[PDB]
Design a binder for these strands. Sequence first.
DNA 1: GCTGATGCGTCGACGGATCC
DNA 2: GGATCCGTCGGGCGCATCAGC
Length: 276
Amino acid sequence: ALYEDPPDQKTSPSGKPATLKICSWNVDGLRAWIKKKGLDWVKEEAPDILCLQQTKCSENKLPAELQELPGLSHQYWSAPSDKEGYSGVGLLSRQCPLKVSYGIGDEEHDQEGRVIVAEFDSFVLVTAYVPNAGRGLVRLEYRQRWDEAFRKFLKGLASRKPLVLCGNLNVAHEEIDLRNPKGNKKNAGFTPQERQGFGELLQAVPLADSFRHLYPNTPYAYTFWTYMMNARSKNVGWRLDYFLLSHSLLPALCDSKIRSKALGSDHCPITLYLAL
DNA sequence: GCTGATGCGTCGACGGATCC
DNA sequence: GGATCCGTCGGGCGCATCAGC
Ligand SMILES: [Cl-]
Ligand SMILES: [Cl-]
Ligand SMILES: [Cl-]
Ligand SMILES: [Cl-]
Ligand SMILES: [Cl-]
Ligand SMILES: [Cl-]
């Protein structure tokens, strides 16, 4: 039940070469991840745009190593005001975005540090660290309300420029998206409510799941494994990290990768190749 | 300033019952 | 009586705060 991500496809269905490489990585403690050489892997991957989630780091505490990325020199960071040490997201880009914003409507009052929006010439990029439903589903109702607020927010944005949404969306959409579907239907990340919310997200905005679009029947493809019980060595995992795309961008889609071998978090990186 | 405790956030292994 | 279903329970990791020094 191990998994080998197939080779990188770097040309679109119409034969156009990839021009844009976006990497998304839920790093689960940015400072720890850097100590575990996460930036060395990033340099090898050489993305045009790097989106990070669960940084657990306010901007004043960013390691200096992050100042020595000449190919990712435009950097935007967010962290929650009243929950330091949790959430936190970042977006780093080769080229300067046209516009950058934070949160999903009222960040200035509910500084949550979970979402960054960056508008580029031909698309809008959103990265998100979606709220976990919590152990015992204690925060599932909050998650459901957040899912609705986020859908409404994104519908707004995609009504003008094509959208790319990436990050830790904290749900395995369908049974194929985790190793143990039967045992986890009452656990955060695989409740009927969260799965429904993801389906409504695809239909309402609308968006497509880039990986599943390309690999509709491929099992055992995950992006998260608990640190407990050696799960990663057994590939007992969940696909929690996505690139979701406006349908108008599917002709630009070259590939959507899962970088299973890259260590330094309990999530692995995912990478998108677009021909723009 | 430093270490290590505690707090907080964040499911697969296992044993036993049930299915035919 | 092997496969499957089901409920219980021990438990890695990062970071903030705190105690001790
Ligand atoms: Cl967190
Ligand atoms: Cl938010
Ligand atoms: Cl999907
Ligand atoms: Cl363990
Ligand atoms: Cl994915
Ligand atoms: Cl792939």
